[PDB]
Design an enzyme around this catalytic site. Structure first.
Site, short mmCIF file in Angstrom:
data_model
loop_
_atom_site.label_atom_id
_atom_site.label_comp_id
_atom_site.label_asym_id
_atom_site.label_seq_id
_atom_site.Cartn_x
_atom_site.Cartn_y
_atom_site.Cartn_z
N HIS A 5 0.82 -1.21 0.00
CA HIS A 5 0.00 0.00 0.00
C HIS A 5 0.85 1.26 0.00
O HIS A 5 0.35 2.34 -0.35
CB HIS A 5 -0.97 0.02 1.20
CG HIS A 5 -0.31 0.29 2.51
ND1 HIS A 5 0.13 -0.73 3.34
CD2 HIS A 5 0.01 1.45 3.13
CE1 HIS A 5 0.68 -0.20 4.43
NE2 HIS A 5 0.62 1.11 4.32
N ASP B 128 -0.34 -7.37 1.27
CA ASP B 128 0.22 -6.04 1.49
C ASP B 128 1.75 -6.05 1.60
O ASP B 128 2.33 -5.54 2.56
CB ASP B 128 -0.39 -5.40 2.73
CG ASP B 128 -0.07 -3.93 2.84
OD1 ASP B 128 0.06 -3.29 1.77
OD2 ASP B 128 0.07 -3.41 3.97
N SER C 73 4.61 2.16 8.21
CA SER C 73 4.26 1.11 7.25
C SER C 73 5.46 0.69 6.43
O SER C 73 6.25 1.53 6.00
CB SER C 73 3.16 1.57 6.29
OG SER C 73 1.89 1.19 6.77
N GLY C 74 5.56 -0.61 6.16
CA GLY C 74 6.61 -1.12 5.32
C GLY C 74 7.88 -1.45 6.07
O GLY C 74 8.70 -2.22 5.55
#
Lengths: 14, 244
Positions: B56, B99, B194-195
């Site tokens: 995402h 994701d 995120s990530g």
């Protein structure tokens, strides 16, 4: 209420 | 250098909650930026040419030239001179739409005391309930200090059966995800994280077990963070790296 933690986040109704 | 073994040893605290990391103690931590320098996600270096992140994070642009990776950093904005900035040449999203994604660097990262890959887990390994792990990143802090610096937090893994209970995340978590956090609240990954990695120390090294993905807010009681379960994607990850 689910929010993906990017900046800005991607938020969803649950 | 060997994967998963930092040259600056990380400290436990004496990202919401947690503390500022010792500089370069998480040498696989990457800052993912647009061509014009906005940090918007983390990532994990997993080999000199490859960064693992959340899919995402890449919704803003399908072009690899829109992205660059920052390696060896501790600050978010005023980067140190030896930091490595490498443009991305290729983007690969997980093909069942989970994701997680791979970034191929246009040039291999130079492996140094400050830039070292994390280790991948063995395929389909399930991190045991209560395992103590670390999350890191430059995300929102919700007033818990350390803004603009690389932060860390130690978090226990919560097995899926428990975190899917009605009182917690109520059936939302897939088997290709894992939960981690303090159920009383106060510690979490948050927007901007995120990530990035969730790593767990095994024997003598840190193994990448999760990728920061989503949550119901950040650091709320009874609402732990959700991470992509890296072990379920190792076979796909290796296939991309070895064919590209």
């Amino acid at each position: 209420g689910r929010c993906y933690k990017s900046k800005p986040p991607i938020c969803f109704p649950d | 250098f060997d994967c998963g073994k930092p040259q600056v040893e990380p400290k436990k605290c004496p990202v919401v909650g947690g503390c500022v990391a010792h500089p370069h103690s998480w040498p696989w931590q990457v800052s993912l930026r647009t061509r014009f320098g906005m940090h918007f996600c983390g990532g994990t270096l997993i080999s000199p040419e490859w960064v693992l992140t959340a899919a995402h994070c890449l919704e803003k642009s399908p072009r690899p030239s829109s992205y660059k990776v920052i390696l060896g950093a501790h600050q978010e904005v005023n980067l140190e001179p030896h930091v490595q900035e490498i443009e991305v040449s290729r983007l690969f999203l997980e093909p069942t739409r989970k994701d997680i994604a791979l970034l191929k660097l246009s040039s291999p990262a130079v492996i140094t005391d400050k830039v070292i890959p994390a280790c991948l887990p063995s395929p389909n390994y399930v991190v045991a309930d209560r395992t103590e792990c670390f999350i890191t990143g430059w995300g929102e802090t919700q007033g818990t200090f350390g803004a603009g610096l690389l932060k860390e937090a130690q978090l226990p893994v919560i097995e899926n059966k428990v975190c899917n209970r009605y009182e917690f995340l109520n059936g939302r978590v897939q088997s290709t995800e894992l939960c981690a956090g303090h159920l009383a609240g106060g510690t979490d990954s948050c927007q901007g994280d995120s990530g990035g990695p969730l790593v767990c120390f095994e024997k003598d090294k840190y193994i990448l077990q999760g990728v920061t993905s989503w949550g119901l807010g950040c650091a709320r009681p009874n609402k732990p963070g959700v991470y992509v379960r890296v072990s379920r994607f190792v076979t796909w990850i290796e296939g991309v790296m070895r064919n590209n």
